[PDB]
Ligand binder design. Structure first.
Ligand SMILES: CCCCCCCCCCCCCCCCCCCC(=O)O[C@H](COC(=O)CCCCCCCCCCCCCC)COP(=O)(O)OCCN
Ligand SMILES: CCCCCCCCCCCCCCCCCCCC(=O)O[C@H](COC(=O)CCCCCCCCCCCCCC)COP(=O)(O)OCCN
Ligand SMILES: CC(=O)N[C@@H]1[C@@H](O)[C@H](O)[C@@H](CO)O[C@H]1O
Ligand SMILES: CC(=O)N[C@@H]1[C@@H](O)[C@H](O)[C@@H](CO)O[C@H]1O
Lengths: 541, 541
């Protein structure tokens, strides 16, 4: 029974020991940079193990930094709540606003009518629409939005009888069937993948954009919003299609002509007509567009286009027009939220003022969304988690440990650049797979910045592939909040998820390694050589 | 039927008209100070009218200020997490932690045992314990904690047959009768009143302390933690006691024995012994004190002690001990939160494996508090409200509103100082009566500071009484959240509460006007004479 104590109490022992075990690192060496390293290491161990609730560990810098003497208490508390975080919160709130009026259901059904009711065509349509959705909102919001539609469509096919929701016929909740697992893992993976396309979709893009633009004010290259799309989208398409093919083969016998599941998908092909009838009758059941949905759509489109035109390459941009003070992208999303609270819902009140119509509303007209709804659904804990990364970045920069570790990693000079790039990709993936993506990106990026400063490489040549690499996380439930939500709301098991995750990782390293060296040259032909403006920085350091 | 239109849809009209109607303010006068004036006025009129939800309107500065050119967008978002805010949020969290383990029940029952069980003594005991609890934590959490205890007690008395909580069946929610009205209003008023006690009682104290420290740094006086308590406590005891007496007279038949309420109280006196049996039997039912409660109590006391002495003082100032960089009071509360997450609940597991006596737990022991609980209880909206208040204060200082309005009120020098102080108190209370406290403090403090600079009057002499008075709100449900919670919990017709408000307002005004002039001179010696360091700023302006 001495083993059972280890079985049911392992989470506590790690908390008790790890600070004590790692205590000597401060004591032996002198500089407070070692104290910063101690804090970073212990916080990382808590993150990866999930001994404490994941959010609460991010609070530690508040007590740590003033005691360690690294940074003043007032500034450290200030660093959490920055404009990017406001953008992210506004995005989540407007996504809930979309969810309120059921518009996503209509969009899904319309796409289904477009594609048809064949099983593989169904899967392809869902993957593509999920990618398109997640290109421009929060990933956790995207998957939470889309999942109930998924449950509805497979329970409709349950009424059809082609598939089974749970692998066992209810024999802990029962294991889901291969088909259901395929659908849920597909939506999760596509949701995660979509972030790489656009700056706005996932916070990691914003974080390393901020880090790079902070370190080098004098960079000739710009990392512009249209150019970021031009770099990102082709690879995005290639590996999302490859992930589709791999997932289809792994679960449904796509390229295996003979399988028991192949008979199942052929049977699903047989009942195409009845599925078409249930789908188009179901669409008919929704009814014509209400106004409510119409202005929701208008606000969403306005928000996206208003992001697009903030000093773009082709256009002058409104930011230059309103050059009174520097305005970030936080303004449009909050503008949308406030208006979404202002505007009415049905406009029936207009009947009394001028119209001859009969009906008149009895009470106050409800607005688009109600604060009672917003409080319950949004995951408020994310603010601390996002703030922790900024706190760590600022602390590491001011304490100077980044310079120490960068000058420590100086032996890599002998290697040719391409193999160094491969090593960078591999280490970035390995680090990401064990925590939240934003935190890992904030840890990793500055030391590579200083490394490139030292080992005479153009910095962006490593920074951009690294930042793109930080996004993927495919085989840990704790790795990425969309994966956590998909673990919820369903009965997926960790081992099967991990073994399914082997494909997309291999695919994404291969495709980044291939397209970076080729496409970036077209995007930037100066990455290979070392520019003079960076030589000035090197001389400065 | 057009009467029904204005009766039902006025909230939309105010939103549509007021921003448009108040437009000429910026058009007629060129200075950006008037733009800031317009912003402040429209925000305030939205606040008082409650057309929009209270929280959402405070978002407006982060969109208005970057466009209007007063201050950059980055700074505005930075203001929303000044350390006082995280201190307040942590205070709410630890209050929930106390709530989780039923400590308040034990405290209330013990105090009831100490005082007695006669009706008037019962009411007095509840009032005193409510005040003592609200001494240290946020007011909304305090009243939300204390509310169901009163429900239980009145249910007990209903079982005894002394009185009925409901007024009458069918004379829409039922009307409450006198006794329950008295009890609930006592709870609300006592909570709000005792919140005035110390620095940590309510966000207004933190707000105006921070403003005073920011505007003036060379001043002799400091308003550290002990001195504020010394200035405040003697007054709060007096007006709390007088409030108790007034509530006894108005609702409970104190001095009028030839009244119907006198006979019911007399009937209550005979049955006091049976109620004593019920009370102490119920206390016996609750059982002995567990380790859980002991731990949470130790953490609470440790937190308050760290506040008391760590900051500069005669004995054992730990801030002096760790003075590499200045550390504020944010550390202890977040320390308590994270520590409260770390510790276990039972200790049976660890001790039992070594001890070998007693059952082995079959699962991991839960921590003191669970993030699921924190998710659904904290009023997360308060962050935006406090941020809006801070933003308004900073913007008014930056743009030049304060200097203009202070110079505009230059004429008030003719009146004697006591009369001026009385006018300040009266106007402060009247403005507090409309909207939330922290907003009024933010609007009022800076203009008073600049005016007192102009009139050559020691600024503390006015700023402290006004800051104390801003807490006092006793009339309308929108004025302060505890009133809303009470009115919602048991339906209260606002007419009765408004009528009952006439007592505490008069009592508080009189006792403040007397006790300031008496006690402040003792605690602060030089208030009457204008100090030289203020004259330096006077020449600076
Ligand atoms: C100068 C730099 C400063 C940096 C500061 C950074 C912030 C703070 C960092 C940490 C500081 C030390 C904190 C120590 C906390 C110990 C918690 C022990 C919890 C515990 O007993 O867990 C059990 C195993 O540990 C054990 O068996 C533990 C053995 C010892 C138990 C007795 C502990 C007594 C209390 C010690 C704290 C001081 C007094 C507080 C009143 C397993 O239990 P489980 O599996 O059920 O866990 C379920 C999850 N909770
Ligand atoms: C060159 C000058 C530049 C100046 C710049 C500075 C000033 C800028 C000011 C911007 C103000 C924007 C205001 C937008 C909202 C207007 C108010 C609408 C209120 C409303 O719906 O009222 C209804 C009653 O009818 C009414 O109140 C009757 C009027 C209805 C008007 C409808 C307007 C529709 C606008 C277009 C909407 C669709 C497109 C959106 C992009 C419902 O009132 P209620 O009380 O029942 O409900 C209240 C919510 N629960
Ligand atoms: C302040 C600074 O960095 N100036 C440099 C300048 O010396 C250099 O000639 C030019 C070309 O890269 O880039 C820029
Ligand atoms: C503000 C400044 O530059 N110097 C002041 C000095 O005028 C004043 O006499 C002294 C008293 O505290 O504080 C310092």
């Amino acid at each position: 029974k001495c083993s059972n104590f280890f079985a049911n109490h392992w989470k506590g022992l790690v908390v008790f020991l790890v600070p004590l075990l790692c205590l000597p690192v401060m004591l032996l060496n002198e500089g407070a940079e070692f104290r910063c390293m101690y804090l970073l290491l212990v916080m990382a161990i808590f993150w990866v193990t999930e001994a404490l609730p994941l959010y609460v560990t991010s609070m530690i810098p508040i007590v740590a930094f003033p005691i360690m003497g690294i940074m003043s208490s007032d500034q450290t508390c200030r660093l959490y709540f920055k404009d990017t975080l406001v953008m992210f919160m506004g995005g989540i709130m407007v996504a809930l606003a979309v969810e309120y009026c059921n518009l996503h259901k209509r969009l899904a059904l319309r796409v289904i009518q477009i594609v048809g009711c064949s099983p593989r065509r169904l899967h392809f349509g869902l993957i593509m629409v999920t990618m398109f959705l997640s290109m421009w909102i929060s990933n956790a919001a995207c998957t939470a939005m889309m999942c109930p539609i998924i449950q509805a469509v497979l329970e409709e096919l349950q009424a059809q009888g082609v598939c089974k929701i749970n692998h066992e016929p209810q024999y802990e909740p029962p294991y889901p069937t291969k088909i259901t697992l395929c659908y849920y893992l597909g939506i999760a993976y596509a949701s995660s993948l979509g972030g790489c396309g656009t700056i706005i979709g996932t916070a990691t893009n914003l974080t390393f954009k901020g880090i790079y633009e902070a370190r080098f004010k004098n960079s000739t290259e710009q990392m512009d919003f249209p150019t970021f799309m031009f770099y990102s989208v082709p690879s995005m398409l290639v590996y999302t299609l490859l992930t589709f093919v791999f997932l289809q083969w792994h679960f449904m016998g796509l390229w295996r002509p003979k399988s028991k599941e192949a008979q199942e998908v052929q049977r699903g092909r047989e009942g195409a007509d009845v599925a078409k009838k249930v789908i188009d009758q179901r669409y008919k059941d929704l009814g014509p567009m209400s106004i409510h949905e119409i202005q929701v759509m208008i606000l969403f489109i306005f928000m996206v286009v208003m992001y697009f035109t903030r000093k773009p390459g082709i256009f002058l941009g409104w930011a230059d027009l309103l050059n009174s003070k520097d305005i970030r992208n936080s303004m449009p999303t909050i503008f949308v939220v406030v208006m979404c609270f202002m505007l009415p819902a049905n406009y029936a009140f207009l009947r009394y003022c001028t119209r001859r119509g009969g009906p008149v509303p009895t009470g106050p007209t409800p607005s688009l969304i109600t604060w009672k709804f917003i409080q319950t659904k949004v995951p408020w804990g994310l603010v601390f988690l996002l703030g922790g990364g900024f706190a760590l970045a600022e602390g590491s920069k001011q304490s100077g440990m980044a310079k120490l570790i960068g000058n420590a990693l100086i032996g890599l000079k002998v290697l040719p650049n391409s193999v160094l790039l491969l090593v960078v990709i591999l280490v970035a993936v390995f680090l990401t797979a064990f925590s939240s993506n934003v935190a890992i990106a904030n840890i990793i990026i500055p030391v590579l910045a200083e490394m490139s400063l030292a080992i005479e490489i153009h910095p962006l040549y490593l920074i951009l592939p690294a930042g793109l690499a930080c996004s993927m996380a495919f085989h840990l439930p704790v790795s990425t909040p969309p994966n956590a939500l998909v673990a919820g709301y369903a009965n997926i098991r960790t081992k099967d998820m991990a073994i399914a995750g082997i494909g997309p990782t291999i695919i994404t390293i291969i495709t980044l390694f291939v397209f970076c060296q080729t496409w970036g040259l077209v995007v930037y032909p100066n990455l290979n050589s070392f520019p003079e403006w960076a030589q000035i920085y090197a001389a400065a350091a």
